[PDB]
Design an enzyme around this catalytic site. Sequence first.
Site, PDB file in Angstrom:
ATOM      1  N   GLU A   1      39.979  43.524  39.958  1.00 13.47           N
ATOM      2  CA  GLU A   1      39.718  42.253  40.798  1.00 13.47           C
ATOM      3  C   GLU A   1      40.617  41.994  42.187  1.00 13.47           C
ATOM      4  O   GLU A   1      40.327  40.778  42.581  1.00 13.47           O
ATOM      5  CB  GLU A   1      39.847  40.962  39.918  1.00 13.47           C
ATOM      6  CG  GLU A   1      38.467  40.873  38.975  1.00 13.47           C
ATOM      7  CD  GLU A   1      39.007  41.797  37.780  1.00 13.47           C
ATOM      8  OE1 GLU A   1      38.081  42.231  37.127  1.00 13.47           O
ATOM      9  OE2 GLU A   1      40.027  41.739  37.280  1.00 13.47           O
TER      10      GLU A   1
ATOM     11  N   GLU B   1      32.210  49.436  34.009  1.00 12.19           N
ATOM     12  CA  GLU B   1      31.839  48.398  32.920  1.00 12.19           C
ATOM     13  C   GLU B   1      30.225  47.893  33.226  1.00 12.19           C
ATOM     14  O   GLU B   1      29.676  47.357  32.331  1.00 12.19           O
ATOM     15  CB  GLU B   1      32.888  47.147  32.889  1.00 12.19           C
ATOM     16  CG  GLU B   1      33.067  46.596  34.489  1.00 12.19           C
ATOM     17  CD  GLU B   1      33.941  45.308  34.227  1.00 12.19           C
ATOM     18  OE1 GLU B   1      34.299  44.746  35.254  1.00 12.19           O
ATOM     19  OE2 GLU B   1      34.315  44.936  33.248  1.00 12.19           O
TER      20      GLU B   1
ATOM     21  N   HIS C   1      47.437  42.648  31.101  1.00  7.99           N
ATOM     22  CA  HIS C   1      47.603  41.311  31.896  1.00  7.99           C
ATOM     23  C   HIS C   1      46.494  40.660  32.418  1.00  7.99           C
ATOM     24  O   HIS C   1      46.364  40.436  33.742  1.00  7.99           O
ATOM     25  CB  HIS C   1      48.789  41.559  32.673  1.00  7.99           C
ATOM     26  CG  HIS C   1      50.126  41.416  32.061  1.00  7.99           C
ATOM     27  ND1 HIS C   1      51.437  41.768  32.866  1.00  7.99           N
ATOM     28  CD2 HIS C   1      50.495  41.656  30.854  1.00  7.99           C
ATOM     29  CE1 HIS C   1      52.261  42.023  32.066  1.00  7.99           C
ATOM     30  NE2 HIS C   1      51.745  41.827  30.864  1.00  7.99           N
TER      31      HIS C   1
ATOM     32  N   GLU D   1      40.461  48.394  40.605  1.00  7.53           N
ATOM     33  CA  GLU D   1      39.025  48.561  40.102  1.00  7.53           C
ATOM     34  C   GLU D   1      38.636  48.129  41.637  1.00  7.53           C
ATOM     35  O   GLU D   1      38.252  49.185  42.406  1.00  7.53           O
ATOM     36  CB  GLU D   1      38.420  47.685  39.280  1.00  7.53           C
ATOM     37  CG  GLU D   1      37.002  48.055  38.537  1.00  7.53           C
ATOM     38  CD  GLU D   1      36.487  46.986  37.652  1.00  7.53           C
ATOM     39  OE1 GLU D   1      35.969  47.624  36.559  1.00  7.53           O
ATOM     40  OE2 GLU D   1      36.892  45.921  37.890  1.00  7.53           O
TER      41      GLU D   1
HETATM   42 NA    NA Z   1      35.753  44.280  36.744  1.00  6.21          NA
END
Ligand code: NA
Lengths: 701, 702
Positions: free
Chosen positions: A471, A495, A401, A489
């Site tokens: 986030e 990433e 999502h 995270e």
């Molecule tokens: Na991120």
Amino acid sequence: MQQKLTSPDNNLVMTFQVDSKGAPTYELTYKNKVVIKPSTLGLELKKELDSKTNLYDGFEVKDTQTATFDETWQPVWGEEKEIRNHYNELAVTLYQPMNDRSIVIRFRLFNDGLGFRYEFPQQKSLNYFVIKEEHSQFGMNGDHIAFWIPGDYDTQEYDYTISRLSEIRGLMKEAITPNSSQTPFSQTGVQTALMMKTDDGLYINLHEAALVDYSCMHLNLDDKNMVFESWLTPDAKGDKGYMQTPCNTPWRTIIVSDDARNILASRITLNLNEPCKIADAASWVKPVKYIGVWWDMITGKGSWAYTDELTSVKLGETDYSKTKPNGKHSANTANVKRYIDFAAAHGFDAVLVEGWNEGWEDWFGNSKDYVFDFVTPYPDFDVKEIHRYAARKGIKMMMHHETSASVRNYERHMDKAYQFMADNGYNSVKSGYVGNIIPRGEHHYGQWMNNHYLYAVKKAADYKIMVNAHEATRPTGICRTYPNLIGNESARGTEYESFGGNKVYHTTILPFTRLVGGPMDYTPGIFETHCNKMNPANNSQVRSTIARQLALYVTMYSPLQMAADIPENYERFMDAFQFIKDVALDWDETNYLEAEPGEYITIARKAKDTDDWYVGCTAGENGHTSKLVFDFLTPGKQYIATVYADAKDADWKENPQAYTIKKGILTNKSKLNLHAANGGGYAISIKEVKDKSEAKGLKRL
Amino acid sequence: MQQKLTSPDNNLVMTFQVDSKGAPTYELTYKNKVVIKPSTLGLELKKEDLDSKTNLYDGFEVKDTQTATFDETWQPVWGEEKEIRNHYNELAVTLYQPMNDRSIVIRFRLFNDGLGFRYEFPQQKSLNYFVIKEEHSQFGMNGDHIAFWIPGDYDTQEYDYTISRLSEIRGLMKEAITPNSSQTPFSQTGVQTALMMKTDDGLYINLHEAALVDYSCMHLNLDDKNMVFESWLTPDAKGDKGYMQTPCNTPWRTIIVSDDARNILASRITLNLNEPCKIADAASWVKPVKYIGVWWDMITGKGSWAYTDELTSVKLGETDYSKTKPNGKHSANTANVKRYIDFAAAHGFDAVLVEGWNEGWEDWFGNSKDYVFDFVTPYPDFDVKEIHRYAARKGIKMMMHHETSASVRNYERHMDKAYQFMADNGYNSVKSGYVGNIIPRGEHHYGQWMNNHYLYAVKKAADYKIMVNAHEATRPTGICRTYPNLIGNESARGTEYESFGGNKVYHTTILPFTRLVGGPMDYTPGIFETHCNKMNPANNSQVRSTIARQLALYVTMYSPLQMAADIPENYERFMDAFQFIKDVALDWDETNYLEAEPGEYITIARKAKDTDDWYVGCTAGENGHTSKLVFDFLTPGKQYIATVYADAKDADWKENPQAYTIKKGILTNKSKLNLHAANGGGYAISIKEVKDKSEAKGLKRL
Ligand code: NA
Ligand SMILES: O=C(O)CN(CCN(CC(=O)O)CC(=O)O)CC(=O)O
Ligand SMILES: O=C(O)CN(CCN(CC(=O)O)CC(=O)O)CC(=O)O
Ligand code: NA
């Protein structure tokens, strides 16, 4: 006059007193060493000079109450089976004559740290109020070494910097790297949890616990006097908190010890959170090991978008069936099934897929309100077939999502979104908030968004759905209250290893900072560290050896573990992949063997409901030599141990894929010397011998 | 070079062209008289995170032009007449801006009674996502006209109107801005729309906008040196004025003009420029509503919305109201509500509104409280199910009340459960409210963000087949044509203020020329006991009206939603005058504007839908008004039973407001009548077609 509070073991002493101008003041010592110099506590309120704005001085002690708490509880999932909550408490009732109102400052002192919070009782002269600034001070006794990231209201995805407190100001500009959503606030502002190392051998961690109905706390350093002060996140109008009595601020914590390992062992953050509010949690909340259609898009090899021929998208109007596939959309049924096959073939629980729904063409930086509906799949993603296929393989699909930071839009679609998950077999969801927040003007960590993140978690619990939010505001132990929040995270993850890389010592710091308050979805497991192999235009290189990636499944705690590389690459290193397959996700015991922030972390964990142990070591640029003593194993028992280590010639940069795998027998009398390379580490699976046949043909290591 | 567009009747002419710097420029004349002097059109965009891209106001070349004529008649679900004709000549101008390699379109539609224009932004490489810094649509006046205005404000429209020359606005602004819990004036010469004006050369000009969707509300800022009004949009929390994504369009901007004030009221340009009805089955469930309610009690201070007064504050889910002491003033209690239900049923009303029925009212005002209401949990003394059972048996519908206290995220979070609660308990209409500063904090009541919310609430309500009446929302611009379930808004100073010091005497002689353009208003007329101290000894406010004028409002303040606002006890004291409120219809097949002069008087006759009955109403200002009525609009050869409710001799809103007379007699299309409306007075007339000679028995000709 002054009040003295001591830890159960007598090592810590917190002294409280109201000074001459009526300002609440506290200090803290550890083994007779100053940890916190006299520091004031209080808050300034927004004007409705008006004395009512003053909630920092003119106080007088009306009452003091002490108490001792000593109870043990069990988390739904964690680093150990049981946690002891043992502290001595001092509650001080402070009356302010000029405003005819009172507040309470509650102190809880543990053997490993101090926690305090402000409480605002319902009363005639204090009901609705707005906080202008919180003024909680943390006076340092010296120019300590700190492991920090820039104070920011919108992102925490920065690489850490290791420097003296006096050096922060001059390094801030360079520490602040580009990000789609970032709002630094001070040349000397940093985020929590903040980790520090003192010259007199102490390790100090400053953080908060139970961030609920309040704005996120950052720290602003007065680098002349070395005093840290709470700096809350402002709303769209600059205000920092709408309160209504009775109410409380979150806890502020100071974890300290002369042994870095004890910083990792502390459970003060979780202990200060409210008990589990999900009555049946045990029946549905569970750890998850997964892989996913993800790295493809992160490296640029594949795309989230279905087509490349549109200037923009209008959901409900744009007819994707009439658009030309860009030939790079990884989220297609056939590809997803390949991942499902791999997942099932190697004992994984779920498969995450990003780019499955309409709208990805406009997902980045457009400040688009109606950007996603979270339910309409692209033409090449067959929701029902994938569900039937995954179920047939004993696999669960992990919903994605991404909200593109459009929060009202997400809330408006949330119930239908969760119902869609339920109707289609998704019981876990990875959410995201990439971009500047909408409502425009708000930041990712203000009181407004903190309410949203929790709202999404509480509603999810109603649907028996587990949440992993990227986030979102970094964790503060709320997982204890809502254990369905299995991750966030909220820090620089793997990433970025694709966006230029993370510092080599990154994973030797996260456990001392980010992880305090909750697990991180770090998505480790990259075997092909050269991203150019995924995408020729991507020259980024993961700063790690293969052995260190394996170690992260033990050194980066989380009930949610991803094997982030693509199936093809794991098939190339299937022997090393065995550790990822074997490693557990939940633990009955955790032993912190070695630990030094920024240099090395070695941890041993006992898989829940078993007598199998897993060990991992992650090292910085200087590597690390470990002298392991397996005395934590059970006497009289034998174990089949498999050691995955860096080759003698391994190097994260020049030779990251050089590793060795050795299998032998271990007992509580075994000892091993292992060396972690530069940006390297090692992993060990230690399985209890059940049947004699298992040890057949094996010798001691 | 110039482009010329003419109205179907040739009376109006719009001239378009770009000046020497490429700035779109238009002008308008009516019967050879300048209405709009050369005025520029354009917008400035927020700079992106090549600089020239911020320019969307000049450097344009007319790349193409397309003309067309439209002439179709349509029927509104409810309205002032059965059919509306949409007849206009159109000119679409494609403007290319070389420096940014992008084009826009400005579409002009000219009617016999006005001009409407809007900007259109086609999808293209150099124009996809953009943020508007300011819209610069000008309306150049040809003189220092007289204007009927209220202060430009991002949060309220509940101000009393002011009548002055354009040059006098600046000096009158300070006093014109009165206190309000949520107000954000923006300029010493800023005003709201619809703006009404009267010129020295006999013209009446109305400046407004139509179809305000996916855009920020438009206000007008006056340059009183050059006499130019210019669009001034409502900023969001960070000062921006519009997040756009092509293809997209701005709302229409309208200039309604005529040398007869009555034609301003008769104009349907606003509705004609809105998109056709999107509710396919609207006719099967959308319907007018005449109601009363537990309301005036709290407004005057006689009763309260709150259940108890012993708590310093409340927290839903924690506060146990069943353990609190009743303040003894809570009007929303089962027994009282049933008394209203009886009255409503006894006198032919459709519904009963009840405010203060749910937990949370103790903290409803000005606390900027997020979790202020849940919209479903009733107080201990409000039996939802028993009240529903009783109302239904009596043939009465309970009207739901959703005051949000301006906490919008909270309302959206509870909205589906709230609407479902309505559906589960017999409510099919809701009165919503947004009192207080908006939350998300930083936003204004009329910004693009809230405009989206208000419509989101209406669109969702349509899915539940629920009708909406929203107070404090952005004033209407004809969206009711698209979503007929939006049967009302307050969005202007209403009757409640007659309890807060009063509304100016001429207030209702202005509203139809301003606020009502774009949609009906829930003005809640019908106050018979104009002395508020009779309700609450401490309230010395006096309603600026005679009883006869209050009756007139059911005809002069159009709305498919009409409240009889006084308490039952007061209507029972004047049951003879109450008859008009009982008789008057809510929907009409025809409407004839007999007399009209903004700020002085308004006389209207309407024909009740599907009947041969007519209703007339006249409202007047401080000077009163004498009417010479000619009933030649009645059917030839027919007899009508007419009942005249007028001000008695020497009636006066202040000194003698309850002085009225009622005369009954026969009327025909040959009848003529002279009636005088007193100061702050008026009159009402019911004209029913005789269906049986027995009805005329004993009656003579007036
Ligand atoms: Na991120
Ligand atoms: O948020 C609270 O403090 C208590 N209530 C208040 C209502 N909540 C709505 C919800 O939880 O869905 C408001 C909110 O979360 O802001 C809910 C709960 O957490 O059990
Ligand atoms: O608003 C639009 O432009 C089109 N869609 C978009 C989705 N809506 C959500 C809704 O209507 O429930 C978004 C919105 O209204 O902002 C809805 C509609 O038929 O109006
Ligand atoms: Na109002």
